[PDB]
Amino acid sequence: VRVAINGFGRIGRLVMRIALSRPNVEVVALNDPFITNDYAAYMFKYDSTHGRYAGEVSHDDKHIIVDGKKIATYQERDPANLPWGSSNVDIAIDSTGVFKELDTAQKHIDAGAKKVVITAPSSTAPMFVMGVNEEKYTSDLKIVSNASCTTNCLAPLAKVINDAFGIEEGLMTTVHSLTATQSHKDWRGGRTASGNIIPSSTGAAKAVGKVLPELQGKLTGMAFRVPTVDVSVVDLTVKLNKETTYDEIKKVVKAAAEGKLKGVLGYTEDAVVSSDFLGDSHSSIFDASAGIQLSPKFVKLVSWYDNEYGYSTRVVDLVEHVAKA
Numbered sequence: 380v381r382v383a384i385n386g387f388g389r390i391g392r393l394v395m396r397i398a399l400s401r402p403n404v405e406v407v408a409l410n411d412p413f414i415t416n417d418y419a420a421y422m423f424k425y426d427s428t429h430g431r432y433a434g435e436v437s438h439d440d441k442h443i444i445v446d447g448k449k450i451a452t453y454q455e456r457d458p459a460n461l462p463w464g465s466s467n468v469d470i471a472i473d474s475t476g477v478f479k480e481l482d483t484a485q486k487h488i489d490a491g492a493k494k495v496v497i498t499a500p501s502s503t504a505p506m507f508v509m510g511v512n513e514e515k516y517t518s519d520l521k522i523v524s525n526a527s528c529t530t531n532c533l534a535p536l537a538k539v540i541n542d543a544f545g546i547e548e549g550l551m552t553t554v555h556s557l558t559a560t561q562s563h564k565d566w567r568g569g570r571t572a573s574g575n576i577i578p579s580s581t582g583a584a585k586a587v588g589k590v591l592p593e594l595q596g597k598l599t600g601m602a603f604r605v606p607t608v609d610v611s612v613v614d615l616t617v618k619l620n621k622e623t624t625y626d627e628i629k630k631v632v633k634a635a636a637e638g639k640l641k642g643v644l645g646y647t648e649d650a651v652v653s654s655d656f657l658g659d660s661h662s663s664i665f666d667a668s669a670g671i672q673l674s675p676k677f678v679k680l681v682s683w684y685d686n687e688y689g690y691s692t693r694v695v696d697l698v699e700h701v702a703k704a
């Protein structure tokens with residue numbers, strides 16, 4: 380599968396690291412009008428949290444070069460100008476977060492790509508979360524969104540819990556890290572991040588309603604942003620339809636993690652802390668020891684996620700899936 384990446388922020392760079400390692404995915408091109416090839420190579424080589432790339436990185440006037448593989452580079456403000464038809468780009472991965480609707484992501488189709496994968500939530504493109512609703516994709520949909528990293532953490536765990544015990548209602552808190560610098564629409568967010576706990580909204584709990592229609596209207600929540608490494612944790616307080624015990628929840632989650640959700644949902648019982656998940660490619664790692672059940676239908680469930688790395692692995696997953704179709 381021949382892919383091109385638009386945008387070389389955190390996500391585009393990690394999607395590229397992962398796609399270089401996928402045997403059936405070939406990275407053909409990169410586009411980003413705001414950086415030069417030498418900065419792109421620097422940014423790709425170094426990462427404060429996910430380590431130096433274990434391989435050789437350089438560049439020339441027309442490529443970024445990774446372990447010898449030359450990857451053509453472009454600087455187009457308008458993706459309609461990119462040579463995707465000429466380059467034979469099967470799937471364009473858009474990680475700019477600005478061409479994230481059906482009419483704007485269309486530009487990659489116009490430029491010659493067969494399909495587009497938006498690495499950001501979308502109001503108009505269909506949204507897919509691996510292990511939740513990817514079986515619902517059909518090969519006539521040409522533009523799709525991988526939702527958000529918090530949605531990717533919550534939705535697999537919510538699906539498992541709802542399938543086994545039913546969710547009547549749930550309230551979610553995410554203790555959310557500073558990913559990168561991501562302030563006149565959000566006053567709390569313009570305060571110094573570095574020493575503060577900063578409450579914030581989130582649409583993650585409601586976007587689960589898109590990929591799990593049966594949970595529509597049954598979840599909401601909020602976030603506390605903290606100044607830690609790029610690993611966050613979801614704190615899900617659910618009212619259940621059916622009585623259960625915490626050991627039963629553990630077995631159900633563990634079975635899904637070892638079975639149908641292998642590689643997407645993880646499971647631990649160790650005395651973990653957030654930095655133990657830097658680089659973890661799961662969407663959601665259930666922390667069995669951190670959760671707590673009060674009564675047979677009322678439980679707090681806890682799940683970790685590297686908010687860049689698991690998401691970016693799911694992106695390349697969705698790319699292969701959309702291609703396998």
Ligand SMILES: *[C@H](CC(=O)Nc1ccc(C#C)cc1)C(=O)OC
Binds near residue numbers: 499500529690
């Ligand atoms: C996952 C990474 C991420 O969570 N970025 C993020 C989201 C919300 C806020 C706020 C307020 C800050 C940073 C991702 O990129 O999904 C879109």
